[PDB]
Coordinates of C-alpha atoms in Angstrom, one line a residue:
Chain A
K1 CA -27.3 -17.2 10.2
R2 CA -26.9 -14.7 7.3
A3 CA -30.6 -15.2 6.5
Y4 CA -31.6 -14.7 10.2
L5 CA -29.6 -11.5 10.4
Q6 CA -31.0 -10.2 7.2
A7 CA -34.5 -10.9 8.4
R8 CA -34.0 -9.2 11.8
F9 CA -32.0 -6.2 10.5
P10 CA -33.5 -5.0 7.1
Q11 CA -31.0 -2.2 6.7
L12 CA -28.1 -4.7 6.1
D13 CA -27.1 -5.6 2.6
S14 CA -25.4 -8.6 0.9
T15 CA -22.1 -6.7 1.1
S16 CA -22.2 -6.3 4.9
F17 CA -21.5 -10.0 5.6
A18 CA -18.3 -12.0 5.8
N19 CA -17.1 -15.3 7.1
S20 CA -16.1 -15.9 10.7
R21 CA -14.6 -19.4 10.4
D22 CA -11.7 -18.2 8.3
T23 CA -9.5 -15.1 7.8
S24 CA -11.2 -14.1 4.6
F25 CA -13.2 -11.3 6.1
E26 CA -10.0 -9.1 6.1
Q27 CA -10.1 -8.9 2.3
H28 CA -13.8 -8.3 2.2
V29 CA -13.6 -5.4 4.6
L30 CA -10.6 -3.9 2.9
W31 CA -12.2 -4.2 -0.6
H32 CA -15.6 -2.8 0.3
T33 CA -14.2 0.0 2.4
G34 CA -11.8 1.3 -0.2
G35 CA -8.7 0.1 1.6
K36 CA -9.1 2.5 4.5
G37 CA -10.5 -0.1 6.9
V38 CA -12.9 0.3 9.8
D39 CA -13.2 2.7 12.8
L40 CA -14.5 0.4 15.6
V41 CA -13.8 -3.3 15.8
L42 CA -15.4 -5.7 18.4
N43 CA -13.3 -8.8 18.4
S44 CA -14.3 -11.9 20.3
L45 CA -12.1 -14.1 18.2
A46 CA -8.9 -16.2 18.4
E47 CA -5.2 -15.7 17.7
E48 CA -4.9 -16.0 13.9
Chain B
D1 CA 1.4 -12.9 -14.7
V2 CA 1.6 -10.7 -11.6
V3 CA -0.9 -8.5 -9.7
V4 CA -0.6 -5.8 -7.1
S5 CA -3.3 -4.7 -4.7
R6 CA -2.6 -1.6 -2.6
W7 CA -6.0 -2.0 -0.9
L8 CA -5.5 -5.6 0.2
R9 CA -1.7 -5.3 0.5
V10 CA -0.9 -8.4 -1.6
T11 CA 1.4 -9.3 -4.5
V12 CA 0.6 -12.5 -6.3
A13 CA 2.6 -14.0 -9.2
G14 CA 2.6 -17.7 -10.1
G15 CA 3.0 -19.7 -7.0
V16 CA 4.3 -16.9 -4.8
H17 CA 2.1 -14.7 -2.6
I18 CA 3.4 -11.8 -0.5
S19 CA 1.3 -9.9 2.0
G20 CA 2.0 -7.0 4.3
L21 CA 5.3 -5.8 2.8
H22 CA 6.7 -2.8 4.6
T23 CA 9.5 -0.7 3.3
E24 CA 11.5 2.1 4.9
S25 CA 13.5 4.7 3.1
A26 CA 17.3 4.2 2.9
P27 CA 19.4 7.2 3.7
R28 CA 20.3 7.4 0.0
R29 CA 23.7 8.8 0.9
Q30 CA 26.4 7.2 -1.2
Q31 CA 30.1 8.1 -1.1
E32 CA 32.4 8.6 -4.1
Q33 CA 29.8 11.0 -5.5
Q34 CA 30.5 12.5 -8.9
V35 CA 32.4 15.8 -9.0
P36 CA 31.5 17.5 -12.3
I37 CA 33.9 20.0 -13.7
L38 CA 32.0 23.3 -14.0
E39 CA 33.3 26.0 -16.4
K40 CA 32.4 29.2 -18.2
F41 CA 32.8 30.0 -21.9
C42 CA 33.9 33.7 -22.3
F43 CA 35.3 35.5 -25.3
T44 CA 38.9 36.3 -24.6
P45 CA 41.0 38.8 -26.6
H46 CA 44.6 38.2 -27.4
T47 CA 46.1 41.4 -26.1
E48 CA 45.0 42.1 -22.5
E49 CA 46.1 45.1 -20.5

């Protein structure tokens, strides 16, 4: 799926992907954003 | 060894791991506060009128 998204959307980079099966994406977003976070979030995910 | 990450909000040391620690200021007011003796130091003659 990472490969497919990269193929369809060239503007994305290796740092614009995280993992949706665990809660590891929080650390990714916080690290790459400088700790500020994100402005919009679109969340079709579960409790944890 | 211990590490602190403000960005990720994590503190890891050995087997412990703390995330999302929030701290609120205490009033800082403590009773029985010290009462220093304040004084001046002035030359004083012997014979005053």
